[PDB]
Amino acid sequence: RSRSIWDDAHAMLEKAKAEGISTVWDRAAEQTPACKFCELGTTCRNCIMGPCRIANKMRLGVCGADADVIVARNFGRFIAGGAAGHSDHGRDLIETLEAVAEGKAPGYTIRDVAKLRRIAAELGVADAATRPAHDVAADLVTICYNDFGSRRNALAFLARAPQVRRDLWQRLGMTPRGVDREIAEMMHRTHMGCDNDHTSLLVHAARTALADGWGGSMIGTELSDILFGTPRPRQSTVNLGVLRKDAVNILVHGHNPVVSEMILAATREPAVRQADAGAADINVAGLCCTGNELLMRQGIPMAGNHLMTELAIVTGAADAIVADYQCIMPSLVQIAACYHTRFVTTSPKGRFTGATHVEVHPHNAQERCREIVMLAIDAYTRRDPARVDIPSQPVSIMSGFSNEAILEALGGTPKPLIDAVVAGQIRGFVGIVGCNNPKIRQDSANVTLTRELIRRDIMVLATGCVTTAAGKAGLLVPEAASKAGEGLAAVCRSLGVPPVLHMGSCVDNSRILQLCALLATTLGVDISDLPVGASSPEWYSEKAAAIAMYAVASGIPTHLGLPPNILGSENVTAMALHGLQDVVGAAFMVEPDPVKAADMLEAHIVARRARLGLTS
243-247 contacts, C-beta under 8 A, 24 or more apart = 243/283, 243/285, 243/303, 243/312, 243/315, 243/317, 243/318, 243/390, 244/280, 244/281, 244/283, 244/317, 245/317, 245/388, 245/390, 246/279, 246/280, 246/281, 247/279, 247/280, 247/281, 247/282, 247/283
Residues 186-225 close enough to bind ligand SF4 by CB under 6 A: 192
User: What CA–CA distance (Å, rounded) separates 310 from 308?
Assistant: 6
User: What CA–CA distance (Å, rounded) separates 292 from 160?
Assistant: 25
Asked if 576 and 587 touch (Cβ cutoff 8 Å), the reply is: yes
Nearest approach in angstroms of CB 327 to ligand FES is: 23
Helix (H, G, I), strand (E, B) or coil at 357: strand
Write the CB contacts of 132 (distance below 8 Å, at least 6 apart in sequence). none
Residue number closest to ligand FES, CB atom: 35
Question: Binding site annotation covers 52?
Answer: yes
Nearest approach in angstroms of CB 53 to ligand FES is: 5
The one-letter code for the residue type at 222 is: E
190 binds, options a second copy, ligand SF4, ligand FES, none, Cβ within 5 to 8 A by partner type: a second copy
35 belongs to the binding site for ligand FES (CB under 6 A): yes
Question: Binding site annotation covers 338?
Answer: no
50 belongs to the binding site for ligand SF4 (CB under 6 A): yes
Residue 442 pairs with which residues in a beta bridge? Answer: 4
63 belongs to the binding site for ligand SF4 (CB under 6 A): yes
Asked if 308 and 468 touch (Cβ cutoff 8 Å), the reply is: yes
**Cα 593–78–224 angle (5° rounding)?**
90
Residues 298-327 close enough to bind a second copy by CB under 8 A: 325-327
Instruction: Using the minimum distance from each CB to ligand SF4, give the nearer residue, 27 or 104.
Output: 27
Residue 285 pairs with which residues in a beta bridge? Answer: 251
37 belongs to the binding site for ligand FES (CB under 6 A): yes
Nearest approach in angstroms of CB 49 to ligand SF4 is: 4
Residues 136-175, one symbol each (x = binds a second copy by CB under 8 A, - = not), give ---------xx-xxxx---------------------x--
Question: Binding site annotation covers 35?
Answer: yes
73 belongs to the binding site for ligand FES (CB under 6 A): no
Q: Which helix (H) or strand (E) holds 304?
A: strand 302-304
Asked if 246 and 280 touch (Cβ cutoff 8 Å), the reply is: yes
Choose which of 10, 81, 172, 232 interacts with a second copy (CB under 8 A).
81
84 binds, options ligand FES, a second copy, ligand SF4, none, Cβ within 5 to 8 A by partner type: a second copy
Choose which of 164, 334, 367, 444 interacts with a second copy (CB under 8 A).
334
74 belongs to the binding site for ligand SF4 (CB under 6 A): no
- Which of these ranges, 33-41, 299-307, 537-545, 557-565, lies near ligand FES under the rule CB under 6 A? 33-41
438 binds, options a second copy, ligand FES, ligand SF4, none, Cβ within 5 to 8 A by partner type: a second copy
Question: Binding site annotation covers 450?
Answer: no
* Other Cβ atoms within 10 Å of 595 Cβ, number: 13
Asked if 577 and 591 touch (Cβ cutoff 8 Å), the reply is: no
Nearest approach in angstroms of CB 58 to ligand FES is: 12
Q: Within a 13 Å sphere around the CA of 18, how many CA atoms are in the beta-carbon half?
A: 10
**Cα 426–431–433 angle (5° rounding)?**
160
Nearest approach in angstroms of CB 590 to ligand FES is: 21
> How buried is 376 (Cβ within 10 angstroms: 0-12 exposed, 13-18 middle, 19+ buried)?
buried
53 belongs to the binding site for ligand FES (CB under 6 A): yes
How many chain residues touch ligand SF4 (CB under 6 A)?
Answer: 14
Nearest approach in angstroms of CB 54 to a second copy is: 10
Instruction: Using the minimum distance from each CB to ligand SF4, give the nearer residue, 45 or 151.
Output: 45
Give binding residues as ranges. Answer: 35, 38, 43-44, 47, 52, 63, 255, 288-289, 327, 435, 465, 506, 541, 543
Binding residues vs ligand SF4 (CB under 6 A): 44-47, 49-52, 61-63, 65, 70, 192
Give binding residues for Fe(3+) as ranges. Answer: 506
